């Protein structure tokens, strides 16, 4: 079940017709079963997640000695250690902020490794762009020189979106929190995520922009 990922559904009539071979067997253990892999994905799934966020915490140079996610990490060394073990076999310390309203769909996942390796962004726009209220003149001083030619002009819109929403993670973020404050610092991003589904791309996109962004001044 490699590929039955995120796919409940499909999963449960795959697993009826893998059911009804035997006419002997009419339990249903498959509800309970469904639930129990799944559980399995999503622990993997947010070990992804914590890899990303470690990486995100050693690119944003944060502070706070974040050690929950060390136990996810516990899980993902053990990766030659568990392979023989059962579905029921360990504990799960995930659901409390690492596993709900965090990774939801691998997308805000993916809306936090916008903001991973690539750092060098993060740098130019901490010292070049001081607060929220200069992204205005910046974009303004920006227009004037981008080109019009509704290729050269979407790239200083993309910029002015991709850095008002990360206004939370790239302005003012003393790095001194820890675990639990950064996830409830995170659920700031997470509800402007939704009004516009294209902030990681956008931030993707104006990061290669990054031998230009240094010309506007």
Same mark, same amino acid.
């Given at each position: 079940?490699?590929?039955?990922? $995120?796919?409940?559904?499909?999963?449960?009539? #795959?697993?009826?017709?893998? %059911?009804?071979?035997?006419?002997?067997?009419?339990?249903? !253990? *498959?509800?309970?079963?469904? #639930?129990?892999?799944?559980?399995? /994905? /999503?622990?993997?799934?947010? @070990? /992804?997640?914590?890899?990303?966020?470690?990486?995100?915490?050693?690119?944003?140079?944060?502070?706070?000695?974040?050690?929950?996610?060390?136990?996810?990490?516990?899980?993902?060394? $053990?990766?030659?250690?568990?392979?023989?073990?059962?579905?029921?076999? *360990? $504990?799960?310390?995930?659901?409390? &902020?690492?596993?709900?309203?965090?990774?939801?769909?691998?997308?805000?996942?993916?809306?936090?490794? &916008?903001?991973?390796?690539?750092?060098?962004?993060? =740098? !130019? +726009?901490? #010292?070049?762009?001081?607060? *929220?209220?200069?992204?205005? +003149?910046? @974009?303004?001083?920006?227009?004037?020189?981008?080109?019009?030619?509704?290729?050269?002009?979407?790239? @200083?819109? =993309?910029?002015?979106?991709?850095?008002?929403?990360?206004?939370?993670?790239?302005?003012?973020?003393?790095?001194?929190?820890?675990?639990?404050?950064?996830?409830?610092?995170?659920?700031?991003? !997470?509800?402007?995520?939704?009004?516009?589904?294209?902030?990681?791309?956008?931030? %993707?996109?104006?990061?290669?922009?990054?031998? !230009?962004?240094?010309? +506007?001044?």
């Amino acid at each position: 079940f490699k590929d039955f990922v $995120n796919k409940y559904t499909d999963l449960d009539s #795959e697993l009826k017709i893998m %059911c009804t071979v035997d006419h002997q067997d009419q339990r249903d !253990w *498959i509800k309970d079963r469904v #639930e129990q892999i799944k559980e399995y /994905h /999503h622990l993997h799934q947010a @070990v /992804h997640a914590a890899k990303v966020i470690l990486q995100v915490k050693e690119s944003l140079g944060l502070n706070g000695d974040f050690s929950v996610l060390n136990t996810l990490l516990n899980f993902t060394d $053990n990766f030659d250690d568990f392979r023989r073990e059962t579905l029921d076999q *360990i $504990n799960q310390e995930l659901i409390q &902020a690492k596993k709900l309203l965090q990774d939801i769909s691998e997308a805000r996942c993916k809306g936090l490794q &916008a903001l991973s390796l690539r750092k060098e962004f993060i =740098c !130019w +726009v901490r #010292e070049a762009l001081g607060g *929220i209220n200069e992204l205005k +003149v910046f @974009v303004d001083l920006a227009s004037i020189s981008a080109g019009e030619n509704d290729i050269d002009v979407d790239r @200083v819109a =993309c910029f002015h979106d991709a850095v008002q929403g990360y206004a939370s993670l790239l302005f003012k973020l003393d790095p001194s929190v820890d675990f639990s404050a950064f996830m409830k610092h995170l659920k700031k991003l !997470w509800k402007a995520l939704d009004k516009d589904q294209y902030l990681p791309r956008k931030l %993707c996109d104006s990061a290669r922009n990054l031998e !230009w962004l240094k010309t +506007v001044n």
